Structure 1
Amino acid sequence: KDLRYGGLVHDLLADSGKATPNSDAMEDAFGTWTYQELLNHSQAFSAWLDGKGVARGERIVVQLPNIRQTVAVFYGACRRGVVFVPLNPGMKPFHLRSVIADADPRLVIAEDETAADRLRDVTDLPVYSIDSLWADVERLRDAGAGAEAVEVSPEDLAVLIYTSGSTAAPKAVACPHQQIVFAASSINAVLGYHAEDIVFCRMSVSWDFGLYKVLISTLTGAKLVLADIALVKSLRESGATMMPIVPSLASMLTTLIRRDPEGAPTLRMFTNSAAALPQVTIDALRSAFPGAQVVRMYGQTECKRISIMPPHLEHERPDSVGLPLPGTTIEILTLLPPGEPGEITVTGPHVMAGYWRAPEITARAYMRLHTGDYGHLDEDGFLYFGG
């Protein structure tokens, strides 16, 4: 439909960079880039990788906060078939050691010089601070470098997304270009982001929750705001229209909102995943933001996302986490009839390429994804947990 099959991630950026070069693409605490600017910096970063001889298929590990440079790193890497491995700032050292070694990168990008030193303790790979490598990126940007394309297959890996905690063995979902682009397009076919949306994103891009607000905004030409007591004020002052949430962020927001009768009227949608959103939170979100839809979703990183409750149905089937993503199938398993509980299983062009270098773990979970969650489909195709 609007579903994209066989896509490359960086093509999302090239399109918007040509289609709306002068619209705002990314804002952070420090400034704003238009789509032209994001394209230029992404190209410049691609030349920096070329300059360092990082080849197609190799990984870079990037431990950065939510700032404009990280998005340019993501796209520039994509443009060279290099594998973006985003990690959250503040991981414990031993945890980093384990994950960096598993990811097996060509090099590592850190937040600043103190962080670059801590990283040097835990790997022998080359480690670059973002502020120092960025002086070069800007030179390259000024020289117009990296503008050329290179061969990248839709089947090539774009990203490894680590989901394992400290106390666990390292584990990353291995994400090819095509699946990513497909999943973004399918989510958006349900959610309806568009070019005048302003997305207020408080999730790290190291989580697929934030990564996909980068992708979905880029896909549609929207503006992404990379964002504590001031949350209400931030939302209102950014003119935010779309906001991904998790239940703890939504409770916080409803507490904060009662202290501020100016609200954040520009808000039109909250999209919840990751955990079950209680009714009381939903009610309080609608009360503070009567203009906004509160949309329930459910997913796993293994296939990005599984179900979305269509916005227009937000008041119905209160126990459901919605319908399958458009272009995908949910089956309950030996296929069971409707209403019969069983394991939630998922088939489609969003199902990712397994876990990175872990045939054994991959075998149990994976062309069909077994979520290890249990529930049923009602008569109409809607998904529920339990019975």
Structure 2
Amino acid sequence: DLRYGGLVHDLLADSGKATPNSDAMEDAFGTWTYQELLNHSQAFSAWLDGKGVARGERIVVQLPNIRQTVAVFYGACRRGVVFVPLNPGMKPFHLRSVIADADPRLVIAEDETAADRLRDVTDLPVYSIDSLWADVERLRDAGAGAEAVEVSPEDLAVLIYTSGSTAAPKAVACPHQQIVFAASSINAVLGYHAEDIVFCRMSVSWDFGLYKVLISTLTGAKLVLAIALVKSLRESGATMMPIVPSLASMLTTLIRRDPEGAPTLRMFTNSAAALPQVTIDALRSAFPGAQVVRMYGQTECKRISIMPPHLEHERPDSVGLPLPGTTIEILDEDGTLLPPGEPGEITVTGPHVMAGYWRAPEITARAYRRAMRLHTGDYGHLDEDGFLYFGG
């Protein structure tokens, strides 16, 4: 089940052929089937071609959770163009630094006001998503962009900026194969399937939401890009919901106000940060059919460990087992393998370890070593069974 040597947009091409008429993406404004998503992705690729954006070049994209952004992502992958997603709400000087570090060919904004703000901070061409969507639709109607082009599994597909306002710009450089591999590996543990409906309140510009786009696409599921939270869940038929502590507490607070519940929910997946016992309990009480799944990871390799769903009640202090096909080792000060029970630096090896930081060899050399071993700067230990824990 694990995917090696893969290309990101092949996930879309596969599902576009296998299930063209299932629903792939719903946002506030409408729904696309897998066929529609592929059509618009191809059209967006022809637009890139029309603008002369070539293999290996970057585009910076600052867009909300809408179908168009997923088409931008895939259409760019299909041309070997590098997707550099940004959160709305960044401050001017922060934008200037990140954009210049990304060094793109062009910039896509949410609307004209946002595009004017972006023009203050770069001289590159900035395009409103609405304006340029008119062209993409014409291109779609003409059947443009169906042509494949040479893209290597080793080509960069995404830059994920992890640096805050107060930091030097720093992005993880993510090639196609690692991305596909990590999506297949996460999914081998979590088991999304074609009949799932994924309710995603997370931004698809954060790798958390991005991989919900990938994993839905890998498996044929439907992704729903989102106070009336409980109703939305129930009425969408939501089965899988990625969460963060803050979103989980809000959900348990809201559910008391709504005794109709959301019985279709079968799994909550938590990355980001420790979910406290009380929230866990409250979720299970409100959705007794739903598993509450712990995970740990960093952007530098997408994800490190997942507690298998069937073991959700066990080893409360663990953040789970390594992703299938990957290795976690605990190293001493001198870089030597520690035995079980012993505290050390959590290190990681495998086909998910990303390519380093974009154009920052020095900083990369200190995290990525020998590179093939990621040193996380987190400390913890493994038990005999291979489960991961923090500290000693």
* Cα deviation 1:139-167 (Å, max 9, x = unaligned): 00000000010000000000000111111
Distance 1:255 1:295 in 2: 20
- Segment of structure 1 superposing worse, 202-211 or 71-80: 202-211
In structure 2, what is the Cα distance between the partners aligned to 1:379 and 1:254?
Answer: 35
Question: 1:242: how far off?
Answer: 0.2
**1:269-328 CA distance string (max 9 Å, x none):** 000011111111111110000000000000000000000000000000000000000000
CA distance in 1, matches of 2:80, 2:353: 20
Structure 1 residue runs without a partner (length 5+): none
What does residue 243 of structure 1 align with? 241
Q: CA deviation at 1:93?
A: 1.0
Gaps in structure 2 of 5+ consecutive residues:
none
SS of 1:343's equivalent in the other structure is: strand
Distance 1:357 1:278 in 2: 38
CA distance in 2, matches of 1:332, 1:134: 49
| Comparing 200-209 and 73-82, the one that deviates more | 200-209
Q: Select 1:260's aligned residue among 253, 258, 261.
A: 258
Corresponding residue number in structure 2 for 1:358: 360
TM-superposition CA deviations, 1:206-228 (whole Å, max 9, x none): 1110000000000000000000x
Q: In structure 2, how many angstroms separate the alpha carbons of the residues matched to 1:202 and 1:168?
A: 27
Give the superposition deviation at 1:205.
1.2
TM superposition shift of 1:12:
0.1
Deviation at 1:186, TM superposition (A): 0.2
Q: Provide, for residues 348-383 of structure 1, a one-character-per-residue CA deviation record: whole Å limited to 9, x for no partner.
A: 000000000011110111010000000000110000
Q: How far has the Cα of 1:79 moved from its partner?
A: 0.1
**What is the CA distance between 1:78 and its match in structure 2?**
0.1
Q: Which residue of 2 aligns with 1:20?
A: 19
Task: Deviation per CA, 1:21-43: give whole Å up to 9, x if none.
Answer: 00000000000000000000000
Greater Cα offset, 250-259 or 112-121: 250-259
Q: Does 1:309 align with 2:307?
A: yes
Moved more, 40-49 or 358-367: 358-367
Structure 1 CA distance for aligned equivalents of residues 253 and 168 of structure 2: 37
14-23 or 271-280: which moved more? 271-280
Q: Which residue of 2 aligns with 1:376?
A: 381
Of all paired residues, the percent bearing the same amino acid is 100
Describe the superposition over 1:42-90 as per-residue Cα deviations: whole angstroms up to 9, x where unpaired: 0000000000000000000000000000000000000000000000011
Q: Distance in 2 between matches of 1:386 and 1:83?
A: 37
CA distance in 1, matches of 2:178, 2:270: 21
Q: CA deviation at 1:202?
A: 0.8
Q: Displacement, 1:347?
A: 0.2
Separation in structure 1 between the aligned mates of residue 215 and residue 22 of structure 2, nearest angstrom = 15
- In structure 1, what is the Cα distance between the partners aligned to 2:231 and 2:365? 47
| SS of residue matched to 2:120 | helix
How far does residue 339 in structure 1 lie from its aligned partner after superposition?
A: 0.4
Alpha-carbon distance in structure 2 between the residues aligned to 1:65 and 1:118: 16
Q: Distance in 2 between matches of 1:86 and 1:26?
A: 18
What's the RMSD between the two structures over aligned residues?
0.4
Q: How many angstroms does 1:200 deviate by?
A: 0.4
User: In 2, Cα distance between the equivalents of 1:142 and 1:206?
Assistant: 28
Q: Equivalent residue for 1:81?
A: 80
Distance 1:280 1:294 in 2: 12
Query: CA offset at residue 126 of structure 1?
Result: 0.2
CA distance in 1, matches of 2:276, 2:339: 28
Q: Given the two structures, how large is their TM-score scaled by the length of structure 2?
A: 0.98
Q: Secondary structure at the match of 2:238?
A: coil
- Cα distance in 1, alignment partners of residues 360 and 205 from structure 2: 20
Query: Which aligned pairs between 1:165-176 and structure 2 lie closer than 5 A?
Result: 165-176=164-175
Poorly superposed stretches of 4+, deviation over 6 Å: none
Which of 294, 298, 302 lines up with 2:292 in the alignment? 294
Any idea what the Cα deviations from partners look like across 1:168-207, whole Å, max 9, x if unmatched?
1111000000000000000000000000000001111111
The Cα offsets for residues 219-240 of structure 1, whole Å up to 9 and x where unpaired, read as: 000000000x111111111110
TM-score (norm 1): 0.99
Instruction: Specify the SS of the correspondent of 1:122.
Output: coil
Q: Structure 1 stretch 21-30 or stretch 249-258: which is displaced more? A: 249-258
- How many angstroms apart in 2 are the aligned matches of 1:158 and 1:343? 29
C-alpha distance in 2 between matches for 1:274 and 1:350: 18
CA distance in 2, matches of 1:206, 1:289: 29
Partners of 1:31 and 1:119 lie apart in 2 by 28
| 2:73 match: secondary structure | helix
CA distance in 2 between partners of 1:238 and 1:79 (Å): 30
1:145 aligns with 2:144: yes
Q: Report the count of equivalent residues.
A: 385
What SS does the corresponding residue of 1:55 show, helix, strand or coil? coil
Q: Aligned partners of 1:316, 1:246: CA distance in 2, in Å?
A: 20
What SS does structure 2 have at the residue aligned with 1:165? Answer: coil
